[PDB]
Design goal:
Blueprint: H1 8-16, H2 24-35, E1 41-45, H3 49-55, E2 60-61, E3 72-74, E4 79-88, E5 98-106, E6 108-114, E7 126-134
Antiparallel strand pairs: 1-4, 2-3, 3-6, 4-5, 6-7
PDB class: immune system
Keywords: anion binding site, RNase, immune system
Assembly: monomeric
Length: about 140
């Protein structure tokens, strides 16, 4: 579900950090134009990539979405976030998909992995790769 020019960390940043508009309909155009389908729902955390990287330094826990993975990490604090929900599909014309937006303040659990050796910047050896749950 990730376009080939992205590492997992870059796709995480594109889907969950870089909300290019405060309006979900506009912000989701980026994700949808890249992945070639209107995503039914998506969460943008109102935080920085660096903050999430530091959450990767919190204790490892089981990933709620996968009882077999132990590469997840719970945020220390709640953050503001915007959850986008598709209201008007448009599979033949992705730019016309419309979304609702729901603001919330919640903790987050992210899966983190070692960076992509060839393509992720050496600045961050450990990077977030999935938004597993918001709580």
């Amino acid at each position: 579900m990730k376009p080939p020019q992205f590492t997992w960390a870059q796709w995480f940043e594109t889907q969950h950090i870089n909300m290019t508009s405060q309006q979900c309909t506009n912000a989701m155009q980026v994700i949808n134009n890249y992945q070639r389908r209107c995503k039914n729902q998506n969460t943008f955390l109102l935080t920085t990539f660096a903050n999430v990287v530091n959450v990767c330094g919190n204790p490892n826990m089981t990933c709620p979405s996968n009882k077999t993975r132990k590469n997840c990490h719970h945020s220390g604090s709640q953050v503001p976030l915007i959850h986008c929900n598709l209201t008007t599909p448009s599979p033949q014309n992705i730019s016309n998909c419309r979304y609702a937006q729901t603001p919330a303040n919640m903790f987050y659990i992210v899966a983190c992995d070692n960076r992509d050796q060839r393509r992720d910047p050496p600045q961050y050896p450990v990077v977030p790769v999935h938004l597993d749950r918001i709580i």
